[PDB]
Structure formats: structure tokens, C-alpha cells
Amino acid sequence: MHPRFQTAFAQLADNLQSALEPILADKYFPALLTGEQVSSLKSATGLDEDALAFALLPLAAACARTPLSNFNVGAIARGVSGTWYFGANMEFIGATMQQTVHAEQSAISHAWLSGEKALAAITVNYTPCGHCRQFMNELNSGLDLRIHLPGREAHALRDYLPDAFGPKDLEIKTLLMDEQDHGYALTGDALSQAAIAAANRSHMPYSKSPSGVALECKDGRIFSGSYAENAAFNPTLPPLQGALILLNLKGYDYPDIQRAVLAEKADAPLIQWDATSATLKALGCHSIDRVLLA
Amino acid sequence: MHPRFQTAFAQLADNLQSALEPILADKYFPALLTGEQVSSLKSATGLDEDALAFALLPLAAACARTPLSNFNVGAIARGVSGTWYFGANMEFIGATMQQTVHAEQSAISHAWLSGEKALAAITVNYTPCGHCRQFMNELNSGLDLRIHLPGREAHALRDYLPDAFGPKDLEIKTLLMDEQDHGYALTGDALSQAAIAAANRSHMPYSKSPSGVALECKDGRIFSGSYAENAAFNPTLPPLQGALILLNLKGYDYPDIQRAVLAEKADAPLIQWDATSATLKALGCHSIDRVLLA
Ligand SMILES: O=C1NCC=CN1[C@@H]1O[C@H](CO)[C@@H](O)[C@H]1O
Ligand SMILES: O=C1NCC=CN1[C@@H]1O[C@H](CO)[C@@H](O)[C@H]1O
Ligand SMILES: [Zn+2]
Ligand SMILES: [Zn+2]
């Protein structure tokens, strides 16, 4: 078991620990649960989904990286597919506040990047900040998304975001998690191609600047991230962040990072290049390349 | 009159135009109104504050810079001092979504930077995004801040941000707009000293990384910006943005920018350097220096 979970695990109910023991066994437990797994857990404990989800929060929170806040936040996105994805906040020393990732954004991207077509709900161990409520309203699930918090009745997003601002406000018809393929040809080595394919799924109706980032680990494993714009602009998820989310959730660490590539247009109104490099260097990765879309 | 206002102005009621004619006369009308001015306006039109504020929105919106969205948003912060500050969104081509500024952040910083001790209300021509609701909850006015939108009853922030996340959540006691002075000694030329003094007023209880940016225009005018952190991290206002807000609001343009300086600690957990330079270069400013706090 991945040391991160150690303590959390020790804190679970016996019947839960038992059901989990085998799953968390693998150090590379992918911070996610399939329907089947979920079902199994429900049988072993008497928990319902909602209560189960809350019960797991602490494992999700155990994946947090909070050098600054020391405030660990865990979230669980529930796929319409039945799969449940963990998510946790990340803070990067040597960068800026704008590079931070919220437990909520983590889980949702985890899901999205993983191929999830839509979410049904999200559970968080702490009420969501406004930035995250806004982020959520970009999804194809809209204001209907249900949100579960400890010691609270559940609610739809619309409740947490009254008189909401969103894509419609900008006359945008395609939502995040909707299907997209920008059609760029894949080229170069593996890393580049991963980066480009990531750009191909990017959500960028506002600026129209597709981008993607792919990271290669020491063991040759690869994590890639897609750009996701947001109607309110700022809460947009940069492509780098996507990759780092996967990387951390999947059990790796910064130092495991070998080289990275960023793909984007050269003539785009917005440019990820600087922020990607800077942050990566901050994390200690020095090999970064950029590939130009067309 | 500053060409930007041209059309807006043409759209105002006659008695309003009249009262304004003289104020807006100056090309460098500072996008702000003192109590006296306000009073005057009320007398000339029969408007009450709330209605007056709405009536002016279009001038505030006229200060917007929206190369991307083409979506002009105006806001008016009302000082407890009686002064009213304009605010408008800004989008920067060649940068990233995270560098964007919301009409709301503009007005509030305008006020804060100007020396305002606290706000009583804010009026916006469009419902606020979640990022801005969160930004607002960092202020010393808390959830009480009143928010006025067109065709809506007014409300407190708490209404737009139910079950809010904020500074208290992190056990923070000093709010934005509260009084602060970090006490760094001022040194170097004027520009540096402006930058450092800006850092001295910075709000950064979370990361403890004070920073400030000062810009020098062709005419030798100087605009400076203070760093303002936010409990939810991301909605934090970088120091550069502060300066650019002032610069644009006060009637200048990017090209008027001569040289810039950024002051910050070298050993700070967060670092503004990269983003500042990058964005400034994007705006076409090549002279940037950094000064190290101590
Ligand atoms: O992830 C969440 N969710 C609820 C509220 C805040 N945060 C995060 O919690 C820390 C405190 O802001 C930062 O890492 C930030 O991203
Ligand atoms: O300034 C505001 N206030 C209300 C909602 C959005 N925005 C802004 O409006 C444009 C559309 O998101 C961007 O410039 C963004 O900063
Ligand atoms: Zn959040
Ligand atoms: Zn906003």
C-alpha cells in the first residue's frame, strides 16, 4: 500500500478496511473505483453510495499536495459510468497562486481525462470555493450536478451558484465533457503524439487555442493533460495541470518526471508556453519541448 | 473627452449628459467620482445612488479591454468614503486565461489601491462569476457586501455565495482592505521605490510572499500594483494586474508603458517573476527589472 494512504486507512471502519485492503494493496492503486468495486464495498459495509463516498473522502484527501496550506481537501467524482474518481488539491512551491489545483478540479479532470462522458455527482470534504463552483458550471451536467458535503443535505449546483454565469452567457453550445476532436494530425515521437492528442480533446471555445501537455516518467509511463477553458476565463484548467493531476493521483511524484512536451498553435491568442515551462522548472523538470499545431 | 466614452455618453439621458459633460471633459478623467460629484449628479437628475450607479455602468464598461470575449463588463465600487470607483474587465492577448481581470476585481482594487478603507456596495452590469464572488469574500466587508445588478433586488454576498469558503476557514484574521504595512525599506530609484511600497501594502497571509509592481509611462507617470492573495488561492490578484488596472482606468494604454519593476523576496514560496515578465512582454514592454525584498 502506498504510504500516503497509511494513516487514513488505519482510520477506516474494520469492515471497510477489510474490503479495501486488497485494492489499496497495490502501490499504484489508481485513485479510482469501478462500479464493481463500489458494489463490493457496499456489500461488505452496509453503506449506500452517498455514505460510502463520504467514508472514502480521507483516502482522496490523502492524495493532496499542500506545501503551502497544509489544508488537505479530497473529492470524489461519480461517473455516469459508475466509476468513481478521486481528486485532491495541489499547491506548487516556486510557482504562483494561479497554478493551484482544487480537489474539485482534480476529480473532475481525472474523470474527464479518463474518458468519462458525464458526471452525476461530486462529494467533497469541504464546501467548494467559488472558483470551483464556477468550474463545475462549465460541465455538460450544468446546474443539475449534485454536490455532497459532510453534514449537509445534498444540493444541485444551482443552489450553490445562484443566478449563475456560464457558457450560455457567451452563447457557447459545447460543454466540457461533451465530445470533441479538433482533428490535428499526430506526429513525432510518442511524447509528442500524446501531447497532440491531448490538444485534440481540449475544450477551448472561448479563445480557440487548443493545447495539450504530456509528461514522461522515468519508467517510461506517460501522463497527458488537455486544456479546458471556462466561461469566466480564469478558472480555466491549463494543460500542464491535467498531467500533473494524473501523475500524482496515479501514484507518482515530481522527481519521477523525465521530460515533457507541450503542443499548441503558434499564432494563438493565448499561450501556455511560459507558464508550463516555468512551473515545470519549478518542479525541477528541465526537459521541455514544444510542438506546433497544424 | 476620452474617445472611449464617446458612444456611451451619447446614450445617456440629457440631464445626465449635462451634469457629466464637464467631468468627462478631461481625457484623463480618472474613472472615479467623489461624494461631491455624486451629489451633484443626484441633484441634476432625479436619481438615487442605486439608480445613478446603474445609469453610469456603461461608462464603466466603456473602459473594458476585451480582445477575446468582446464582452464588456462594467462595475462600480462604492467607497465607505463616498467615492465611487469604476472597474472593467481586461483580457490580454498572448497571455493565458489566468491573467484575465474581472470588472469586479478592477473596481475593488481600484478602490483598495486608491486608499479606500472599505466598501459598502458594488454594482455590475452582469451577474458575477464565482471567481468574483470568491474574490469579494476576501474583503473586510465579508458576506455583508451588497451587490447590485440590473433588474434585481439587491443582495448581500452571502446570498450569492451560500455556504461560503473564506479566510476564516484558514484561520486568517486580516482581511483585504484592512490595514497593512510589511515594513520593507524603500530603496533605489523612484520606480523601485514605488514597487516596494506597493509590496508593503500587499495582502499575503497565505503564502507570506509580498510583492509589488510599478509601471512608468512615457510621460513619467507611475502606476503601481499590490499583491492580493485569496483564501481559495487561485482568485488572487497578481501585482502586475493591479498596475495595469490603474493604468487603463486612468486613461493610458499599453504602449504608453515605458519600463516596469517588480519587487519580491527571492526565497519566497511563490514567485511572480515569470508571469509578470511574460505578460509584460506580451503587452510589448521589454524593460522589466526585479528588486529583492529585505
Ligand atoms: O481544493 C479545494 N477545495 C475547497 C476549498 C479550497 N480548496 C484548496 O484548498 C487550499 C486552500 O485554499 C488550496 O490548495 C486550494 O486549491
Ligand atoms: O468581468 C466579468 N464580470 C462578470 C462575468 C465575467 N467577467 C469577464 O467577462 C469576460 C467573459 O468571461 C472576461 O473578460 C471576464 O473577466
Ligand atoms: Zn475550489
Ligand atoms: Zn468575475
Curated annotation (Swiss-Prot), chains A, B:
Cofactor: binding comment: Binds 1 zinc ion.
UniProt: Zn(2+) binding residues: 102, 129, 132
Annotated keywords: Hydrolase, Metal-binding, Zinc
Cofactor: Zn(2+)
Subunit structure: Homodimer.
Function comment: This enzyme scavenges exogenous and endogenous cytidine and 2'-deoxycytidine for UMP synthesis.
Name used for this protein in its record: Cytidine deaminase
